[PDB]
Design a protein around this ligand. Structure first.
Ligand SMILES: [Cl-]
Length: 77
């Protein structure tokens, strides 16, 4: 039994700012695609080189697996 990380995202035109409150994984989903990011571990991690006007979803979780509910946003133009 344990507490999984909480997180917020805010989306910018070509990057997403991921704010985590704490092996730890930040999963970036686009359509068809899933990228797994490994932050160097309250930190902020920035997913960059993204496409404007595109939907992305983010999930944060510890690996040993409960994937967080996804948080999604639409990047501005
Ligand atoms: Cl790069």
């Amino acid at each position: 039994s344990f507490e999984p990380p909480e997180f917020e995202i805010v989306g910018f035109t070509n990057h997403i700012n991921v704010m985590v409150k704490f092996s730890l994984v930040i999963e970036e989903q686009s359509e068809g695609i899933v990228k797994k990011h490994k932050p160097e571990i309250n930190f902020t991690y920035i997913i960059d080189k993204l496409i404007p006007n595109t939907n992305y979803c983010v999930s944060v979780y510890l690996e040993h697996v409960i994937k967080s509910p996804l948080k999604c946003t639409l990047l501005p133009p």
